[PDB]
Design a protein around this nucleic acid. Sequence first.
DNA 1: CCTACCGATCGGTAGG
DNA 2: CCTACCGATCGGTAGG
Lengths: 184, 185
Amino acid sequence: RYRAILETAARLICDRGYEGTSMQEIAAACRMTKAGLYHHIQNKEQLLFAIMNYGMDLFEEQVLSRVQDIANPVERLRACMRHNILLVTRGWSKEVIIILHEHATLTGETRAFIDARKKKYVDFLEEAFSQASQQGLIRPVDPTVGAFSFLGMVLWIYKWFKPDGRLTDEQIADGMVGMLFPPF
Amino acid sequence: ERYRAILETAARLICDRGYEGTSMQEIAAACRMTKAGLYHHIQNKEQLLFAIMNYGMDLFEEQVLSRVQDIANPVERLRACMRHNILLVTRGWSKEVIIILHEHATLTGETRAFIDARKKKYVDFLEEAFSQASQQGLIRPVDPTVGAFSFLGMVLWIYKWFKPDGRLTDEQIADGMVGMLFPPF
DNA sequence: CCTACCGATCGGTAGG
DNA sequence: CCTACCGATCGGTAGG
Ligand SMILES: CC(C)CC(=O)SCCNC(=O)CCNC(=O)[C@H](O)C(C)(C)COP(=O)(O)OP(=O)(O)OC[C@H]1O[C@@H](n2cnc3c(N)ncnc32)[C@H](O)[C@@H]1OP(=O)(O)O
Ligand SMILES: CC(C)CC(=O)SCCNC(=O)CCNC(=O)[C@H](O)C(C)(C)COP(=O)(O)OP(=O)(O)OC[C@H]1O[C@@H](n2cnc3c(N)ncnc32)[C@H](O)[C@@H]1OP(=O)(O)O
């Protein structure tokens, strides 16, 4: 019902962008009128905030929740990279791509709320890079450099990847994992 | 030149507020013109973005490829390219370059195929050095495409999180990113 | 949720 | 519901 609308607004806000998508063609896609759409959601800003929260929920469910209980820090980063890459490549959630593209669209309390959820993922990586680097499991590296190098590789995928391209998302994953986390 | 000054001003705005979110009225106000005087120098809004992106590529090719394309050692070329490409972003001087990174799917038709075709000249350049470096054993074997977009991922994503007033300098980010993907081997 | 509309603003163009 | 402009306004659309 409710999240069935975000499913529809996310598809449009993703193809045409937040500022480029209108509340008219969203409601027209949801089979309503501009007025009827405002009954379920407060306004266009709260619509994006909802989409970006529903995205972080799907992210934590299919990535962090699967790798947060791995003892070896480097083994935890490998699995995290492989799961994150498949989340972007498979295209299972367009709410996640909106979070990567509209990174500076929100403002105020809605901005600070999602930003605080994103930095929880950075601190997760900063910690794993600080553990591995100290246990001698990877070449020494500043935990921040590693975290955003990690994030840069996997999250920049949404700008160039296509499922019908040469390689598969599987091959790209194996290649990046071995490229950043090789046996040491 | 007056035309160039308009691309720079219109770039600083379109970077902050975005393309679809910037108005031709406030671009004109920024250029200290009337909205009609603005449309004398630029055809329309679509062509204003196109010109901003071409000017950004000219800058990129001047401040990056032009500085490293004559290096013989392939890994030493990937190290200097990363350095220069990282600084180009952390400096924030060329907001036209940032618009290229963010508004990647804003253009359409021939204007995008044009900018996308100049972009692809940069992945072919990286794929080569990543193919030469693997054959010459200067880096661990890797598919050239996976290496090019790992190079670009680390480097270009910087525009989404870097703040010049953080704890690390743009130099420290370069050293750590280089040493992490192109370590002595 | 619809029909009816609003304040304002959109990209673009008119005559001088 | 000729160059580089200008003051004013075109037809349509935005979020609400
Ligand atoms: C300021 C400066 C630094 C800016 C730049 O130059 S960065 C440009 C390169 N890096 C980017 O992140 C840009 C992302 N946006 C773009 O438009 C990219 O340039 C491209 C998507 C590659 C545009 O290339 P274009 O050929 O015009 O469009 P296509 O998608 O049809 O081309 C396909 C090419 O994309 C890549 N690709 C996409 N999917 C896969 C895949 N599954 N496996 C392997 N490679 C893949 C790949 O490079 C492919 O090229 P080919 O395989 O045909 O040689
Ligand atoms: C699948 C998907 C949903 C996964 C995610 O959640 S995305 C992971 C977030 N990574 C991104 O690149 C997204 C784009 N960037 C952002 O959204 C923001 O920068 C966030 C890091 C998430 C939030 O930043 P926030 O703390 O709210 O506000 P700030 O502007 O003060 O950011 C400061 C933090 O960014 C980093 N940073 C920025 N500049 C520097 C620097 N010069 N040296 C070292 N680190 C730096 C750094 O992590 C910093 O945090 P602190 O150093 O203060 O602890």
